Design a protein around this ligand. Structure first.
Ligand SMILES: Nc1nc2c(ncn2[C@@H]2O[C@H](COP(=O)(O)OP(=O)(O)OP(=O)(O)O)[C@@H](O)[C@H]2O)c(=O)[nH]1
Ligand SMILES: Nc1ncnc2c1ncn2[C@@H]1O[C@H](COP(=O)(O)OP(=O)(O)CP(=O)(O)O)[C@@H](O)[C@H]1O
Ligand SMILES: Nc1nc2c(ncn2[C@@H]2O[C@H](COP(=O)(O)OP(=O)(O)O)[C@@H](O)[C@H]2O)c(=O)[nH]1
Ligand SMILES: COc1cc(S(=O)(=O)Oc2ccc3[nH]c(C)cc3c2F)cc(OC)c1OC
Ligand SMILES: [Ca+2]
Ligand SMILES: [Ca+2]
Ligand SMILES: [Mg+2]
Ligand SMILES: [Mg+2]
Ligand SMILES: [Mg+2]
Lengths: 54, 422, 437, 343
């Protein structure tokens, strides 16, 4: 039960109370997966038109 | 988010005509197109189904299609006949003769291009088109044959817009021709592939409701169409009136259709009407889920609900609405799939339908709908096994194999609806 | 320094609209952006300038960016009471929403607008002498709140690799749900945002709904009631940034004090007291009474049982008439009765912060004005319950591949589902390895 | 109508409780994986408490108290005693016990040898016993290396053996009192007025392990005198009480039950702040089985607590109904217990 680091100011104060001691990808990689998704989205569409063409 | 309406055939134009006659009243639009209402809520989303014209006129975004001029001459001469856009009347003369082939391959082909010109013109003036809704029967020739042809062609041109349909199923109890199973089976295959949302309106159900429940000894098509109007108003409430759910056709499909082919909804409505006593919230809920209020002639207890969307209309305790909705789910928990959490959605609208203070409309993606397709399939095979009446279709260029395919596609759909029932 | 708040999706925009409302009330900023208290018109290196820039006319403009693929929600900010605060460059809208589809908000409708959002963000970032990081408000369940948020977090991690990124996330609840595919979106967006968010505050709508019902006696809580409560907690968490102090003074300190393990960065927030303003006068709770309430599950922002979960960190953020001696006595007495088991590799202690200014409330709101309030941030392993609940719902629908076709139709691959889920199983493993007895 | 699910088929007690609920006609059994239930008869291991109390408009109850394993396991019980001020290290009714980890694997090995050498040098009876939660494997020995090597040969425990047990004169055998306790959602402690005595069939020999262990399985397997005196080697309170009067000139209520009721209260009040579901989003109840042992001075001891007990054949009907009456219908409306009052 020890208060430490008692910082005080006009607007408030803060402290710590110890009670027991202890015992990213790049822009290209983003555009790669993004554009790759539109490829599957445009291929799945092309297949639909090809099916409708039949 | 605008919607383009299309009505095709005798049934398609007659139920579609009543749909506009109903919502026009709900929004305060007179037969001339002028607004004469009281609540601004009537107009906040009027653009969804109406185009504003010069002089504050509201013209429906509807297209009227038929291979005969008869049923469309009546519409123009009907009560709200003067409100429809004249250019949007597209009709032939030879008719389809209750033949799917004639509507899909020969006579409809001659006319289909002209229709798309109107569809294109309407879509061009849509700031954010969300999709199309079609009204038609599957038992005839025009709405069934040509209607599916339009759906197929519209998808090719608007592949990223929602395709919605109100599809009236044939029934021997209400029959015009013995080839209705042939026409319906061919159409169902088309709907399976080329629609997102199909409201299954079974004439067998409409008849029984008129006969058993409403106590009408001899129902007429007008009597059955009063039921369809009430339902069509109910399932478009969230589109036509503002809410906290910002409902649109795409959202409905994403949440109602767990599997792309199982998008055939059982619609229900309460109270069934042909009357002064107001109906309580528990009464609406009980009747709504009751099979006697279903418009598809399937026993929900013989199947399971994959997803459900309910709309209550009128001034009522939304807390009570919950209390009674959750009660049904917790009571009939065996008739809802356990592997789709929160598969029942409820919305409330303060504006009630004309004539009632309290109403409730119900949209159900139930596996019991397989009973309906099984009924059509049996009637289809009963004739096809003897090639009976096929000469009407082979004379229009079709081959037997195309029937065998639609038969298999029908039986496959039933099997798909079955696997998810266990 | 400066902090940029980003509000994504319906929930993010509405909650942000509620937060900046409360910030203005707490800082005395008028709905026209004019702060009479500010005597350094045009400048000001004060603590509240971290969230508000000052124009030549003396207008305090939020350092915020509202984004939604649909224009209906943000239009109410443009025609709302606080319309004058923001300039239109900060309010970005699309035309079609994501239809509750993560793929539609990340791969298809999101990719169309990401470049613009980043540019608008850069328009504010360049107005910052030293930018600390970003505060991201969004929902797990929304199509835009999940799909577009994850896309942005990927791009922010590239354009601002040094800056920190904090999350305020709405965990889905059936009581206020919006779609049945919400579990799918909640899992996809957590997997794609975990490596990028430095610390995330989850708010379960179930907790807020029940709190509004029980403590505020609201039969059917609205999003307004929920957001007004949520903004009070957000204010407690962000108070240290907007007011002078020494605890959690910068965004990096949230990570230091609450996030020892980067993947376990979901502190559990507990707030008290919540009093119905309808009550003419309430028995104002004491410092010890509100502190004890921090350990009652009914007051947590996520329904779980901290008793069966070891703590790793704990911050007490008091606001109002609170003195250190009261806090220490409450802490000592609450140790004896409660069961607060930390991990063996962390000190069993509490970092405390007091702001004398009492909690502010909106006029005509539901929250009564209290003299002292506390928000506890405790990084407890017990919050893994929420991941398990969310994961079980995911496994139920995915077993039958229900609704998956909607995502693959936008470009997504069925594999990305199992990838995201296997990551969630790893997160549940990490929580267990830290909470074993 | 009320909703309940089942996830423990091997539960002979709640297989009966499931029977009665359906018989009322006001309860319905759903499937184990249906999330919409009012009540769960969950499994023993890995009960998903984190998923409970999250269904709107659905009051959910479960028949297990989360965190009760601290009292129903050998290692945790001993660690609960001592570390608990309520159940102080100086617990008069708890046999001296120590937690031992196998050498292959905190540990209390050197502390066990501490209080052992005192008895050897003090001429006192120094017989001990070792057991574990993985039992049907038990050893009773007076040496140290024999018991600790047997442990090396999971977490075990060693406690002092009742070298002076109370013996029923008509046979000179050892009994084992089993009392059933029910704790409802309100944490009211209910003791069943009917108990059983898993009596032995061979004479206790203080110089073999059949006359030392009084499990109904050992008596039905190793013993040959099964059923000689009482039926099934299971005496009830009515027969036992009469023997106390004719032999020791006392009664069951005073010489034994007073202590049993005290031990039950002390244990459950100790972990009450750790398992109580009073302000929780779901509620819990649970039936417990306390095993006691009485020595020659009519002093009751605590052997073990079981979280999934099995009730006697005769008393299944009377007990399992009492579960529904006070634990299930108290929250879901449609005496044989002694309420142990407390604070
Ligand atoms: N707390 C709170 N939750 C909200 C609010 N608005 C929506 N939600 C929750 O957010 C989830 C749905 O996400 P939304 O933000 O509405 O969807 P979105 O971000 O607009 O994405 P879209 O699907 O494209 O519309 C649901 O679980 C709702 O409960 C709000 O104002 N406050
Ligand atoms: N300290 C001790 N002194 C004397 N006998 C003891 C003892 N500890 C255990 N026993 C004997 O061991 C027997 C079984 O011990 P324990 O209760 O651990 O077995 P178990 O887990 O099979 C009981 P249940 O069948 O109720 O689960 C008791 O009935 C008792 O006769
Ligand atoms: N509900 C309803 N069904 C109709 C109507 N007219 C025809 N039907 C049904 O639809 C089928 C006949 O289709 P029809 O619309 O006449 O075909 P089409 O004119 O060639 O498009 C049969 O099953 C009829 O029972 C109608 O006005 N209302
Ligand atoms: C216009 O059609 C309607 C559209 C909508 S919605 O756009 O909000 O879609 C949703 C959103 C979430 C959902 N959860 C479930 C299980 C279904 C569901 C859903 F359909 C709701 C309607 O009534 C509830 C409705 O009926 C007329
Ligand atoms: Ca200033
Ligand atoms: Ca980072
Ligand atoms: Mg006809
Ligand atoms: Mg939205
Ligand atoms: Mg045994």
């Amino acid at each position: 039960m020890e208060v430490i680091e008692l910082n005080k100011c006009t607007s408030g104060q803060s402290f710590e109370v110890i009670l027991k001691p202890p015992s990213d990808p790049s822009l290209e990689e983003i555009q790669k997966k993004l554009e790759a998704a539109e490829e599957r989205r445009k291929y799945q569409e092309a297949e639909l038109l090809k099916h409708l063409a039949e | 988010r605008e919607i383009v309406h299309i009505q095709a055939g005798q049934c398609g134009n007659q139920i579609g005509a009543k749909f506009w006659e109903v919502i026009s009243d709900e929004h305060g639009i007179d037969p001339t197109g002028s607004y004469h209402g009281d609540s601004d809520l009537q107009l906040e989303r009027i653009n969804v189904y109406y185009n504003e014209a010069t002089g504050n006129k509201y013209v429906p975004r509807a297209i009227l299609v038929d291979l005969e001029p008869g049923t469309m001459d009546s519409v123009r001469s009907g009560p709200f006949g003067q409100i429809f856009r004249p250019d949007n009347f597209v009709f032939g003369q030879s008719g389809a003769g209750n033949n799917w082939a004639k509507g899909h391959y020969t006579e409809g082909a001659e006319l289909v291009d002209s229709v798309l010109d109107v569809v294109r013109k309407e879509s061009e003036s849509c700031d954010c088109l969300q999709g199309f809704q079609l009204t038609h029967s599957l038992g005839g020739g025009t709405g069934s044959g040509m209607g599916t042809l339009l759906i197929s062609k519209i998808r090719e041109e608007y592949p990223d817009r929602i395709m919605n349909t109100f599809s009236v199923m044939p029934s021997p109890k209400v029959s015009d021709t013995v080839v209705e199973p042939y026409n319906a089976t061919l159409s169902v295959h088309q709907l399976v592939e080329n629609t997102d949302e199909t409201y299954c309106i079974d004439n067998e159900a409409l008849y029984d409701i008129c006969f058993r429940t409403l106590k009408l000894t001899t129902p007429t098509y007008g009597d059955l169409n009063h039921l369809v109007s009430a339902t069509m108003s109910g399932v478009t409430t969230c589109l036509r009136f503002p809410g906290q759910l910002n409902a649109d056709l795409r959202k409905l499909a994403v949440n109602m259709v767990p599997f792309p082919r199982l998008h055939f909804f059982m619609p229900g409505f309460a109270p069934l009407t042909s009357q002064y006593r107001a109906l309580t919230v528990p009464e609406l809920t009980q009747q709504m889920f009751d099979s006697k209020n279903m418009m598809a002639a399937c026993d929900p207890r013989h199947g399971r609900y994959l997803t459900v969307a309910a709309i209550f209309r009128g001034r009522m305790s939304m807390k009570e609405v919950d209390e009674q909705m959750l009660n049904v789910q917790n009571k009939n928990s065996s008739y809802f799939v356990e592997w789709i959490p929160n598969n029942v959605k409820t919305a409330v609208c303060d504006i009630p339908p004309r004539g009632l203070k309290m109403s409730a409309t119900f949209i159900g993606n139930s596996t019991a709908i397989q009973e309906l397709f099984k009924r059509i399939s049996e009637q289809f095979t009963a004739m096809f096994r003897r090639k009976a009446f096929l000469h009407w279709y082979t004379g229009e260029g079709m081959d037997e194999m195309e029937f065998t395919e639609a038969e298999s596609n029908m039986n496959d759909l039933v099997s798909e609806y079955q696997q998810y029932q266990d | 320094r400066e902090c940029i708040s980003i509000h994504v999706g319906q929930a993010g925009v509405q909650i942000g609209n509620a937060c900046w409302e409360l910030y203005c009330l707490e800082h005395g900023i008028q709905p026209d952006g004019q702060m009479p208290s500010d005597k350094t018109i045009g400048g000001g290196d004060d603590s509240f300038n971290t969230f508000f820039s000052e124009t030549g006319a003396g207008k305090h403009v939020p350092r915020a960016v509202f984004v939604d693929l649909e224009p209906t929600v943000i239009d109410e900010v443009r025609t709302g009471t606080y319309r004058q605060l923001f300039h239109p460059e900060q309010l970005i809208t699309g035309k079609e929403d994501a239809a509750n589809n993560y793929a539609r908000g990340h791969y298809t409708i999101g990719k169309e607008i990401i470049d613009l959002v980043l540019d608008r963000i850069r328009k504010l970032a360049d107005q910052c002498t030293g930018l600390q990081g970003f505060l991201v408000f969004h929902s797990f369940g929304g199509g835009t709140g999940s799909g577009f948020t994850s896309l942005l977090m990927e791009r922010l991690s590239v354009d601002y690799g040094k800056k920190s990124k904090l999350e305020f996330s709405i965990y889905p609840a059936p009581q206020v749900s919006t779609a049945v595919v919400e579990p799918y979106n909640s899992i996809l967006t957590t997997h794609t945002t975990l490596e990028h968010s430095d610390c995330a505050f989850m708010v379960d709508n179930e907790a807020i709904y029940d709190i509004c019902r029980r403590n505020l006696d609201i039969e059917r809580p609205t999003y307004t009631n929920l957001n007004r409560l949520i903004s009070q907690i957000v204010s407690s968490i962000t108070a240290s940034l907007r007011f002078d102090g020494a605890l959690n003074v910068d965004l990096t300190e949230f990570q230091t004090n609450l996030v020892p393990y980067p993947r376990i960065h979901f502190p559990l927030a507990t707030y008290a007291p919540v009093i119905s303003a309808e009550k003419a006068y309430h028995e104002q709770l004491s410092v010890a009474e509100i502190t004890n309430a921090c350990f009652e599950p009914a007051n947590q922002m996520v329904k779980c049982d901290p008793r069966h979960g070891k703590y790793m960190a704990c911050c007490l953020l008091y606001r109002g008439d609170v003195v250190p001696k009261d806090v220490n006595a409450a802490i000592a007495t609450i140790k004896t009765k409660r069961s607060i088991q930390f991990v063996d590799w962390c000190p069993t202690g509490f970092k405390v912060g007091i702001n004398y200014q009492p909690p502010t409330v909106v006029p005509g709101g539901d929250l009564a004005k209290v003299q002292r309030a506390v928000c506890m941030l405790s990084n407890t392993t017990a919050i893994a319950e929420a991941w398990a609940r969310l994961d079980h719902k995911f496994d139920l629908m995915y077993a039958k591949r229900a609704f998956v076709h909607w995502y693959v139709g936008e470009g997504m691959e069925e594999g990305e589902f199992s990838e995201a889920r296997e990551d969630m199983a790893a997160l549940e493993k990490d929580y267990e390895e830290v909470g074993v007895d | 109508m009320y909703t309940f699910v089942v996830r423990d088929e091997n539960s002979s007690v709640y297989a009966e409780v499931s029977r009665l609920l359906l018989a009322t006609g006001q309860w319905k059994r759903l499937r184990k994986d249906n999330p919409r239930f009012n009540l769960m008869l969950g499994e023993r291991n890995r009960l998903p408490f984190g998923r409970l109390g999250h269904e709107p408009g659905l009051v959910q109850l479960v028949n297990y108290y989360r965190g009760a394993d601290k009292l129903c396991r050998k290692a945790s019980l001993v660690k609960l005693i001592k570390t608990s001020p309520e159940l102080s290290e100086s617990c008069t009714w708890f046999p001296e016990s120590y937690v031992i980890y196998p050498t292959n694997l905190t540990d209390e090995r050197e502390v066990f040898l501490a209080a052992y050498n005192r008895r050897r040098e003090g001429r006192e009876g120094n017989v001990w016993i070792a057991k574990s939660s993985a039992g049907a494997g038990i050893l009773i020995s007076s040496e140290a290396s024999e018991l600790l090597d047997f442990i090396d040969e999971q977490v075990h425990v060693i406690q002092k053996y009742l070298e002076k047990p109370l013996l029923l004169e008509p046979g000179h055998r050892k009994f084992d009192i089993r009392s059933w306790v029910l704790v409802d959602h309100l944490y009211n402690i209910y003791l069943y007025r009917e108990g059983v005595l898993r009596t032995s069939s061979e004479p206790y020999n203080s110089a073999d392990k059949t006359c030392h262990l009084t499990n109904h399985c050992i008596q039905k397997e190793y013993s040959k005198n099964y059923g000689r005196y009482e039926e099934g080697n299971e005496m009830f309170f009515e027969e036992f009480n009469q023997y106390l009067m004719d032999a020791l000139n006392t009664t069951l209520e005073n010489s034994i039950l007073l202590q049993i009721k005290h031990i039950i209260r002390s244990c459950l009040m100790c972990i009450e702040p750790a398992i109580s579901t009073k302000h929780l989003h779901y509620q819990s109840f649970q039936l417990f089985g306390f095993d006691f042992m009485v020595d020659e001075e009519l002093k009751v001891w605590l052997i073990e607590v079981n979280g999934a007990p099995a009730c006697a054949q005769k008393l299944y009907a009377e007990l399992c109904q009492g579960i529904v009456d006070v634990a299930i219908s108290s929250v879901f409306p449609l005496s044989i217990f002694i309420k142990l009052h407390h604070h």
